Design a protein around this ligand. Structure first.
Ligand SMILES: COC(O)C1CC(Cl)CCC1NC(O)C(O)O
Ligand SMILES: COC(O)C1CC(Cl)CCC1NC(O)C(O)O
Ligand SMILES: COC(O)C1CC(Cl)CCC1NC(O)C(O)O
Ligand SMILES: COC(O)C1CC(Cl)CCC1NC(O)C(O)O
Lengths: 307, 307, 307, 307
């Protein structure tokens, strides 16, 4: 059938929530791929029964065979070891997966999750051969969900009604752009002026946003639900030609003064993949922060090449 | 049952789409009220069958009896004649409906649609006795849907990703605030700077927005689908405690320099009705336009009182 | 874009609700076609604004040009005059539309609504040249929505949890199969045995079901909301490859003893159109009723050919 | 706010999917309760960010404090050790939780998951003091999702279009009622007669259904996604007054010849909790199987009382 085929390369915790959400949303058939024997088949079987509760009709299958990438419309990569020593190990995984994408599904739209995402997405771009508009990395949708959510709780408004931009890279050098925050489309500064939220409060929210993964890990949990939902928002925009503006890691070709590297910026996602790369008109102080993010991606990319 | 009861006072074209959408969304039981015999019962019966297709369970009943307002959680008023000569006639309808609200459902949340809305909502406020946080008028959600949509089509982005503010009043004096337009939370001016949309294009879109009802009437149609969807977005925010920021007509108590009048401004809608009135920090030129909108509402309110 | 294109041939009341529902469900781009000037453009414009409220991205355009059928994935025909004298007039409309389908969109999936549907669907099948699996008529989903709904109200259960079969033809000779009614998958007879609903009650519900269109017309309304929702359930099953079992008019090739005629029977609708025709194992008494339905379709088909 | 408060007593794998699904569906505020320190707060924080992606507004909080049951509208119990030796241990947990329900939320609707469910639900009923219509156990929705799904895959129909009844108890003595299976509301026997599925195939599907939890465990996974979706279907029916017919464990008062015990049977779930208990008109052979299921529940209930 013309139902979409979505292959999850990596069947860990994020993969499991993704399969669940795909079925809830009836988005397409799902392959849970992993090199681990049996497990993806088990998760696939459990998930498949939810078609009944959800009134959906998506096949959910497990796989240890890379050739099941054939016919994929979307491929979502979470596979990888989870420190700089892991970089060359995860490069080798991106190499392996990229060769299989080129062979089996060169026209697939690819979303990379493996950290550090801004590095790993470019490695997979290089090894898979796919066009620049057909591969992105997770970052900004996830990072801004935290910022938007925390502000919405202070202001007692619907979370989605807060909008915000975090750019450059996923990770500790993410650039939180105070000037680009709105509430119901209104500049956040109006709310600061009105003493509904203070500058000091926002500073604390910014730090919390940057450190959220660490906060969750120290609570004896770890982030997989919100990462999964962010990825599925991205995949859905592609599959349904929604043309949502979503911040993702993408190949820069001069934007922000940078080329020959991936970084986080708003893009438009629809049926042609990355339909538009939107370059924020950053001031010099914001650009300097963007530059630090890119420098760190470059540092790690260099370590990834050889053991 | 604790299912919400939603009474549509007026069972014309907007009422018919509202009942349809309530069932699609399983939002509550529906009464289609009208003074017209038989017709509301017919529309109610037709609509009721869609529970099957929608997997919903909402009762849909017709009514010619005002006492069926008893137990209403939400009351949506579209009743009215459709020029200044109609003002005193529609005031008498608001009086009649207000007396029935006070008697039967004083705790209901009230949405007024009857034009001119900014006048009629205040008349109903006065005659119904309901608290200021429990009655609003349709305006800005509908008017901004046009502006957002037209810009989204030029920019090839998801319509909801354009945000915009139109304030003061529904109608020909609506205030379109160019400074408060964003695309993916980014100021529209960045897109103008980048020559993705021009100032001249936006001027044409502004005029189209103001004249949209007329454009549709001259096409041998008339607006009822988008008005209905806007109203249901508002009602839904209340019923589900979404706390969405939505522009509606509400009692001003000093905002923008105005008191003892209703006008269009962003508000937050949740379980307590109007939870917050948001006052945009308008500059003097924008305030002058706001003042013209209010002056027109006042002119018409004065004509409404006596035949 | 690979977004589906859905052309509504006929932009009357059913067409207007269909366009609304397509946007709510983000199912595809919509053309409201009619021979009436201006009106489809007006309805299209009104409807298009609801993309904002619905978080959808479907184009909604009006058209007086048949060549806009090009590229259609789904075509829904409601055009027609609304008595036997109309039969040859509506045949000529089916001829005209069929020629345009063959030319512009021979691979489209076609849903016919024009009454009498079981006749008009076959005429369009003949004139369009499309495969037997790619054209169906509205009937059973709509007629059974009434029966299911009325029983659900008596039994105080979710409407969708009542299932029921009405076959043969849409219209006054529809065959209501008492033996094929279930409630939560349980035979209705168990509920009769338990005195939760009586045989006399069901007889009254059967008559009400057959006469529902007339009941609504006499209430100074007419059925368009539930017909629209039924059609969109069918179209959605096709577009999303849901493989729902839905009763529709389809070409019979021996089922029930009948060939070379369309009639109402459960079918499975997915990406290949009619994937399966399900033949109920009717007893002789039920078959006799089926035969009467077919005889009436044949009588009218013969009158349709010439003025 | 009148937003529902849903307390998940137990924040393990099923609890985590439940919180995710509640947010996706905007069903209410969520407390993830556990005796484990920190972890529920971590899962709560991760999940809370999905309000943004989902356009929802549900609070998600963690808790180690039983008094946070106050104000709960729905309480879902998954807490428990996971063999007969565990029975007295899990009884003590039900005792503890029941005392806290009686004190803090005596009017809450309670769903029990802890295995063996048909025993543990009755123990919690006894210790909590809640009315018989306000507490149910998970079983039949989950078990029948497997049966429905497996048949739908053989017949190439939408999974939800297969209906089926499994009664008596959750667990290895579940009663699979071949006579009560339908496909699009049609008796499955018609499909057997037509050689679309054989008796031997159905026997294999029956065994697979009974052993599904074991099949998933042996695949180096374990069932939590489909159990969570089943529970949320039940909770949703209550919260939204859907009046769905759903098979759950409930207090029997003579049905099937049994009293003073809980067992699996179709019930109707709406705003008043268990609105109707539906007693299938089982034949003597089916009743004998039902009796074996009840006997096993009784055996285990007796072991639960003392260490
Ligand atoms: C740690 O290894 C993985 O998790 C993994 C997962 C996938 Cl989905 C593919 C390949 C993977 N690994 C390798 O190819 C490898 O070189 O170890
Ligand atoms: C033109 O009259 C109406 O449409 C109408 C509608 C409702 Cl729903 C109530 C009262 C109404 N009218 C009056 O009370 C009236 O004074 O005419
Ligand atoms: C009564 O005429 C119609 O409503 C109509 C509608 C469409 Cl959509 C096509 C053709 C139509 N008519 C004709 O072709 C005609 O022969 O009159
Ligand atoms: C194994 O213990 C649990 O998992 C547990 C969970 C909850 Cl949510 C409450 C009480 C619990 N336990 C006890 O009260 C206990 O007696 O151990």
């Amino acid at each position: 059938a013309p139902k979409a085929k979505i292959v999850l390369v990596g069947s860990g915790m994020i993969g499991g929530v993704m399969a669940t959400l795909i079925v809830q949303k009836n988005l397409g058939d799902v392959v849970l791929f992993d090199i681990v024997k049996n497990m993806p088949h088990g998760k696939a079987l459990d998930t498949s029964h939810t078609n009944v509760m959800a009134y959906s009709n998506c096949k959910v299958s497990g796989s240890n065979t890379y050739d099941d990438l054939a016919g994929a419309d979307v491929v979502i990569v979470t596979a990888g070891f989870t420190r700089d020593d892991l970089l060359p190990l995860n490069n080798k995984i991106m190499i392996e997966i990229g060769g299989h994408i080129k062979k089996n599904c060169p026209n697939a739209f690819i979303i990379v999750v493996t950290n550090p995402v801004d590095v790993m997405v470019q490695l997979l771009h290089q090894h898979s051969g796919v066009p620049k508009n057909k591969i992105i990395g997770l970052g900004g949708v996830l990072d801004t969900s935290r910022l938007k959510y925390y502000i919405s709780q202070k202001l007692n408004v619907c979370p989605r009604d807060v909008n915000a931009h975090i750019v450059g890279a996923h990770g500790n050098k993410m650039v939180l752009l105070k000037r680009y925050i709105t509430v119901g489309g209104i500049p956040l500064q109006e709310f600061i002026n009105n003493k509904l939220i203070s500058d000091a409060e926002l500073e604390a929210i910014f730090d919390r946003t940057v450190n959220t993964a660490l906060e969750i890990v120290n609570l004896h949990a770890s982030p997989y639900v919100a990462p999964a939902a962010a990825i599925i928002e991205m995949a859905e925009s592609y599959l349904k030609d929604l043309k949502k503006v979503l911040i993702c890691s993408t190949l820069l070709e001069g934007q922000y003064g940078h080329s020959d590297i991936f970084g986080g910026t708003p893009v438009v996602l629809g049926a042609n993949g990355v339909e538009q790369v939107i370059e924020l008109q950053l001031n010099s102080e914001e650009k300097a922060k963007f530059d630090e993010a890119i420098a760190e991606t470059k540092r790690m990319k260099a370590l990834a090449h050889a053991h």
